[PDB]
């Protein structure tokens, strides 16, 4: 995506689905035997996703308008929107 941005190109990135990343990080963390996070997802998922999502942007005119757009996708596994992810 950054290659598009660097070029000043307008592009769009679909991240489908972040939910399976969370499962991966759960597996990973618990088999690095790091204490179970909230709802069995290590508490640094927020950092993981937040950093990821802010790397899609409509950059400055100095940056040649690198307009990467993001569309995250979370598939509600019960319609439970109060779930951590």
Positions in the binding site for another protein (CB under 8 A): 20, 23-24, 26-27, 30-31, 33-40, 42-44, 46-47, 50-51, 53-55, 57-58, 77-78, 81-82, 84
Of 7 and 50, the one with the shorter C-beta distance to another protein is 50
Spell out the residues 6+ positions from residue 30 whose beta carbon is closer than 8 angstroms to its own: 36, 40
CB of 37 to another protein, least distance (A): 6
Over its C-alpha atoms, the chain yields an Rg (Å, rounded) of: 16
Of 13 and 53, the one with the shorter C-beta distance to another protein is 53
CB 30 within 8 A of CB 36: yes
Of 14 and 23, the one with the shorter C-beta distance to another protein is 23
Is the bond preceding residue 17 a cis peptide, omega within 30 degrees?
yes
Start-to-end CA distance of the chain, whole Å, equals 23
CB of 21 to another protein, least distance (A): 11
């Amino acid at each position: 995506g950054e290659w598009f941005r660097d070029n000043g190109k307008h592009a769009l990135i679909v991240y489908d689905d972040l939910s399976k990343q969370a499962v991966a990080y759960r597996q990973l963390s618990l088999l690095l035997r790091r204490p179970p996070g909230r709802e069995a997802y290590p508490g640094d998922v927020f950092y993981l996703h937040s950093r990821l999502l802010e790397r899609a942007a409509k950059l400055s005119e100095k940056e040649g308008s690198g307009s990467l757009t993001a569309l995250p996708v979370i598939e509600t596994q019960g319609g439970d929107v109060s779930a951590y992810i």
